[PDB]
């Protein structure tokens, strides 16, 4: 599923996720446009072997697993294809789990180069929330 930019936010809060661990609902919506375009069915292949998955490109390193990558964890407790799903609530609760990990967003490197320290409200601006 492609969602769209509102109808996200809207997902992200009903989830739990606007102000999760101090983010706002901006940062959320940043992060997910940088990394899957607001596609839930995004995949990318990391030079390790590893592959993000989902709408924030969850990586299977440390919190999903695929079955595909050597020496990984499943921090998550999900398979990598929960990931996927039209419905956000797997890849929200894993978020949740990164999120609060150490390095807060910083864990997601798009959301640090293209979103932290920007106009992260623009990303919700004109959404009935
Ligand atoms: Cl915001
Ligand atoms: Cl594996
Ligand atoms: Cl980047």
Request: charged letters at 20%; aromatic letters at 10%.
């Amino acid at each position: 599923k492609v969602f769209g930019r509102c109808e996200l936010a809207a997902a992200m809060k009903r989830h739990g996720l606007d102000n999760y661990r101090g983010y706002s609902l901006g940062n959320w919506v940043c992060a997910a446009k940088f990394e899957s375009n607001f596609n839930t069915q995004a995949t990318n292949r990391n030079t390790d072997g590893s592959t993000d998955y989902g709408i924030l490109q969850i990586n299977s390193r440390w919190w999903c697993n695929d079955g595909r990558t050597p020496g990984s964890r499943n921090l998550c407790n999900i398979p990598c294809s929960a990931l996927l799903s039209s419905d956000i609530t797997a890849s929200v609760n894993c978020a949740k789990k990164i999120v609060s990990d150490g390095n807060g967003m910083n864990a997601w490197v798009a959301w640090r180069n293209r979103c932290k320290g920007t106009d992260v409200q623009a990303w919700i601006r004109g959404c009935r929330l």
